[PDB]
């Protein structure tokens, strides 16, 4: 969270398993795997997600139906600010792997088209 130091709020970061599916409300998101991120306590929120393994048998995919999970964030309350602080702010996101990640079957990437 890259807002002001006096901004206080709660977010609900829901996780959906690889079966199904995208939730439709904050109550449906709360009734599954979730993390309540309090802005006024922590500036960062770290969560490790399992079950990421996708195998594709084509070189370039159009569009190769996938059954991966989702991450959604929901406004639990709001962002509460004192006067003379702007109402808009910005969340940054970061991604990496853990020290168990296993790749196999090296190909050429489809991001070059010379």
């Amino acid at each position: 969270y890259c807002g002001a130091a006096m901004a206080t709020g709660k977010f609900l970061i829901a996780y959906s398993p690889p079966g199904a599916g995208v939730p439709g409300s904050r109550r449906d998101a709360m009734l599954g795997t979730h993390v309540i991120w309090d802005v006024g306590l922590q500036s960062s929120c770290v969560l490790c997600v399992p079950w990421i393994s996708q195998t594709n048998y084509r070189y370039v995919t159009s569009d190769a139906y996938t059954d991966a999970g989702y991450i959604t964030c929901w406004y639990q309350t709001s962002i509460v600010t004192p006067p003379d602080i702007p109402t808009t702010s910005t969340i940054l996101c970061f991604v990496s792997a853990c020290n168990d990640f296993s790749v196999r079957l090296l190909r050429d990437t489809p991001f070059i088209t010379q």
């Binding site: 393994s53 996708q54 195998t55 084509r58 995919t61 190769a64 139906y65 996938t66 296993s102 790749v103």
Partner: peptide, 15 residues
Amino acid sequence: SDTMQTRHVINYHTR
């Protein structure tokens, strides 16, 4: 064709 799937893997961790 075509689908990408999760497909549970035993713990062997190739690198």
